[PDB]
Ligand binder design. Structure first.
Ligand SMILES: [Fe+3]
Ligand SMILES: [Fe+3]
Ligand SMILES: [Fe+3]
Ligand SMILES: [Fe+3]
Lengths: 170, 170, 170, 170
């Protein structure tokens, strides 16, 4: 590649794997959101929450793919593993699942940072720090807030608390 | 009739019976809504829900009657059977009743479709598919959502959940 | 399911497979568009073409998923097969590939129509006819137009014609 | 200097040399742009391209000079070497030259990053990452796009392709 400069094949491969990870999370959020749209689940607010996460993680991957081209790497696409569940239980269960998912993207984001730093790629480090590293911390905090408030409500009246959280928070 | 063309007497009779069915549902929703307006029931939100269903099913019948004239059939009017109940119990009971009612209009709508199709009346099929078939599926889904959320709330605090649903959903 | 009515398990399974097909096409268009964004390919116009197809087929699948819930079926998600190619050659090759892809969705759409009709599901037939059947014919025609104009331009000056089409048509 | 803090003489000297490098590139772009304004060259679009690069690299150096003062270093000015050519040939040749030039600023930018990092100057690293590191990658990508499109057009009709690129891209 004529434009390629200071872009290592170790990093380019990582970005490709991270594109795959973001798309699979976006796929998971798609499943999550449409499950709460079920007539036997019927939690409007929870569905819109996970559908916007699906979009956000999709724009995240499109951002990586664009950066891949700006640096002179070749995007390579793999199969998208299906979501780990077909039914996600309650809001508390869904939220729990989401937080583990975000914590594993964040893990992947940090490893890719440590990689690009050992490779002395300051532009990659700057790209992850602005568009990704901080959004991921804000989101996990916001998700943790939700977990604490759901666990409070589910406490005695499980069915009532799920309704109140969806109406009054989401 | 001079304008009549490809309009069978089997179908024309069906439309007349379906006019009668829609009017009787609109009558039922009228009863339902004014029952929740009772001082000993006093659920503003539930009353407005059923009154708008009463109007919607009334416009539905006026639509059939107009189509009847556009095709060259003769509208014939029968007695409107009174609603099956004088008192409708709780929101959960009312909703249950409504869903059975909508499911029987939808049944009538599908039979009238199957009839007009066997008669090779493509215009009737198109008329039911746009103005009726899809509204009826949306509505039953929306009603099912309500049932799931009421059943969640009525769970432990029956009286409290009825209030919250009416204030926070309707 | 309480809301389910006139919805067969044969059809519900088809919709799920068609959700999968639309997502995999949307995945393909994602690959196609980002390939033309390559510095060694550099055809802005062709990239934006395929990226909007990626979105459109994604909204298409979200539409099916929403309809699945409105009818009382359960959405089930499978793995997304990766795109058939990693590099797509020229505009003429990409366009050729796209048309075969659209022609196979359209095939899937027609089979699902024939299925829902034999099952006497008039609402499914109406849903495919408005939101899908006509968009798919318009698109294939528009794609065929592009093929004829590319084949004209690639005729003598392959490299020049690709530039002119991208600047003057896309 | 009273305000100086965590600012090493190795780095301050680098910034001064990089000021000189940016000014000499801005000088080169000045030559490039006014050459395409020649009546025997007459490529309006190519001239405006290189003149805006001349400004941009000039603002870049003024930015370094301002940062030098904010940190407490002393700006020292050297002679500006004249451009390497007096006549730059075709658009393809000019573009080739530009890309090598940008790739050598980017090289200088990365070395100055590696230097300030080994010196543990996090503010310098942040200054290069926001105002310079990313602009330089975007630009080289954009320049590579241009090279691919020129090489496509120059293919058979060299004189015609130069005109079309200038009219339809620049
Ligand atoms: Fe690297
Ligand atoms: Fe008929
Ligand atoms: Fe069916
Ligand atoms: Fe320093």
């Amino acid at each position: 590649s004529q434009i390629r400069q200071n872009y290592s094949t170790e990093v380019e491969a990582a970005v490709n794997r991270l594109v795959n990870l973001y798309l699979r999370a976006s796929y998971t959020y798609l499943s999550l959101g449409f499950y709460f749209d079920r007539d036997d689940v019927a939690l409007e607010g929870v569905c819109h929450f996970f559908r916007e996460l699906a979009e956000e993680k999709r724009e995240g991957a499109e951002r990586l793919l664009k950066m891949q081209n700006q640096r002179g790497g070749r995007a390579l696409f793999q199969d998208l593993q299906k979501p780990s569940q077909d039914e996600w239980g309650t809001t508390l269960d869904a939220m729990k699942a989401a937080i583990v998912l975000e914590k594993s993207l964040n893990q992947a984001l940090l490893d890719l940072h440590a990689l690009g730093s050992a490779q002395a790629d300051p532009h990659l480090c700057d790209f992850l720090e602005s568009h990704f590293l901080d959004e991921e911390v804000k989101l996990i905090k916001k998700m943790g807030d939700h977990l604490t408030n759901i666990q409070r409500l589910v406490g005695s009246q499980a069915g009532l608390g799920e309704y109140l959280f969806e109406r009054l928070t989401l």
